[PDB]
């Protein structure tokens, strides 16, 4: 049931890399402090997402065996997972405990950010669903690593090589679910289930951004590569 020394090593290594991300408080403090216009909010999103992608590439490069993979497959994994990892990180930030009334203001500020109503409902549905899972930081880190090392991504030439890298992370996550939540034996299945709902955010991500109540949708050259916009 317990983690082996090799698994404990893997977990702490993944945790240290995951911890290099912009702190959730640095994000919520800005949104909660002042109400910004839809124009200012689009620029905040774009800057946030550019920092997220940069840190995500550095996290991905540290994943055991990632640099042994074929160069084209490395690109396909990063490009295939960037949007999903972004929404998983936003779901983590959204569900962090804040003082009484702060989370309600946060949801209200995100609701009036400039995004269309059509996309608000499924976004908060996912955020609430992941929040009900009461995930630990280790679970978010491993789940992000599992999302990145998905062998079923399009344009992957060597799926087996990706499978070999994802399998020990899946084993570690399963053990943690059994340790953190022995009451809920469905917890691991629930986590893996939430990964299919993450995939739905891919199909209409570009439409989500273009529907923003702003005159000009300016993206950085890095976001254009990752989001297929402009």
């Amino acid at each position: 049931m317990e983690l082996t020394p090799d698994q404990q090593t893997l977990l702490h290594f993944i945790m240290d890399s995951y911890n290099k991300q912009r702190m959730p408080q640095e994000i919520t403090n800005k949104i909660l402090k002042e109400a910004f216009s839809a124009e200012e909010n689009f620029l905040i999103l774009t800057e946030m997402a550019t920092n997220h992608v940069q840190v995500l590439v550095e996290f991905t490069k540290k994943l055991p065996g990632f640099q042994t993979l074929d160069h084209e497959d490395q690109i396909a994994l990063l490009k295939g997972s960037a949007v999903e990892a972004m929404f998983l990180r936003s779901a983590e930030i959204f569900n962090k405990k804040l003082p009484s009334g702060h989370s309600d203001l946060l949801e209200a500020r995100i609701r009036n950010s400039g995004i269309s109503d059509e996309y608000i409902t499924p976004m908060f549905s996912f955020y609430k669903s992941i929040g009900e899972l009461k995930m630990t930081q280790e679970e978010y880190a491993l789940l992000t690593a599992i999302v990145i090392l998905s062998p079923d991504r399009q344009y992957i030439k060597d799926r087996e090589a990706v499978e070999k890298l994802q399998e020990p992370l899946l084993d570690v996550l399963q053990k943690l679910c059994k340790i953190h939540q022995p009451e809920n034996p469905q917890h691991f299945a629930c986590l893996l289930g939430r990964l299919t709902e993450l995939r739905t955010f891919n199909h209409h991500h570009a439409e989500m951004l273009m529907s923003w109540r702003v005159n000009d949708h300016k993206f950085t050259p890095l976001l254009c590569e990752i989001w297929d916009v402009q």
Partner: peptide
């Protein structure tokens, strides 16, 4: 097609 991504990966 993804030269910035390639660069960040090949740093």
């Amino acid at each position: 097609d993804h030269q910035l991504l390639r660069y960040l990966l090949d740093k």
